[PDB]
Amino acid sequence: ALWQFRSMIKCAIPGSHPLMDFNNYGCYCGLGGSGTPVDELDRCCETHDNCYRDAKNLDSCKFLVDNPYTESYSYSCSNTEITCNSKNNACEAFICNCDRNAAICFSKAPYNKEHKNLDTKKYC
Numbered sequence: 317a318l319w320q321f322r323s324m325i326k327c328a329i330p331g332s333h334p335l336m337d338f339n340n341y342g343c344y345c346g347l348g349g350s351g352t353p354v355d356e357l358d359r360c361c362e363t364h365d366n367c368y369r370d371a372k373n374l375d376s377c378k379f380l381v382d383n384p385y386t387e388s389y390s391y392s393c394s395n396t397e398i399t400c401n402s403k404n405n406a407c408e409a410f411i412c413n414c415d416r417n418a419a420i421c422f423s424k425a426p427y428n429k430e431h432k433n434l435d436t437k438k439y440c
């Protein structure tokens with residue numbers, strides 16, 4: 317679920333900015349997206365979006381109001397290391413996996429301030 321994705325990110329990037337949740341980043345970091353990612357970080361988000369899209373296409377899975385972000389799962393954090401619980405059901409494991417990979421991807425990408433709250437309608 318969305319709130320778990322945020323904690324997962326805190327887990328991988330302890331020095332994250334709490335107020336960052338109020339803003340969007342690049343072309344894909346945020347609800348929806350358009351065009352092509354502007355940088356590595358943005359790519360991580362697009363990929364995560366794509367991962368959720370695949371989640372919505374799983375024949376055996378249908379989420380509340382069709383939003384994968386509502387699906388809560390179980391996971392643990394240890395030394396900035398994320399682990400999805402094997403007890404998660406297939407749908408939850410798929411979502412937990414998308415989040416884990418995205419969080420890891422975020423931790424390795426450069427944060428470019430110029431892309432914060434980008435004028436998407438013009439550069440995306």
Ligand SMILES: C[C@H](CCC(=O)NCCS(=O)(=O)O)[C@H]1CC[C@H]2[C@@H]3[C@H](O)C[C@@H]4C[C@H](O)CC[C@]4(C)[C@H]3C[C@H](O)[C@]12C
Pocket residue numbers: 321322325329331332333336337338339340341345346347357361422423427
């Ligand atoms: C983890 C990312 C920032 C990394 C960073 O702050 N590096 C600097 C570290 S340091 O000071 O130099 O130590 C931030 C950039 C924009 C953020 C995204 C945007 O805020 C858009 C949404 C907001 C939602 O609440 C959570 C998912 C999300 C899709 C966020 C995931 C994550 O929190 C992102 C991808």
Ligand SMILES: [Ca+2]
Pocket residue numbers: 344345346347348349361365
């Ligand atoms: Ca998005």
Ligand SMILES: [Ca+2]
Pocket residue numbers: 377378379380
């Ligand atoms: Ca269902």
Ligand SMILES: [Ca+2]
Pocket residue numbers: 387388389408
């Ligand atoms: Ca659940």
Ligand SMILES: [Cl-]
Pocket residue numbers: 345346347348
């Ligand atoms: Cl989002």
Ligand SMILES: [Cl-]
Pocket residue numbers: 378379380
């Ligand atoms: Cl349902």
Ligand SMILES: [Cl-]
Pocket residue numbers: 378379380
């Ligand atoms: Cl459900």
